[PDB]
């Protein structure tokens, strides 16, 4: 478990490792907006 003073962000941390994935999803939202140019 995390040290207690960070107890707080426990559920943020359960989510952090997936954020790199979001960047790939994000590249497709960008290309949808620019018309797959």
């Amino acid at each position: 478990k995390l040290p207690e003073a960070y107890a707080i962000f426990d559920p943020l941390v359960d989510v952090l490792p997936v954020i790199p994935v979001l960047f790939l999803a994000l590249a497709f939202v960008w290309q949808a907006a620019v018309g797959f140019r």
Binding site: P11, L22, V29
Partner: peptide, 27 residues
Amino acid sequence: AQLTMIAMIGIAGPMIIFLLAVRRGNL
């Protein structure tokens, strides 16, 4: 409590695109 901080991260990305468009930026 996994909406008090997560929802905002997933929205963060598409929000950058809705603000650069609707303000025409170099996309």
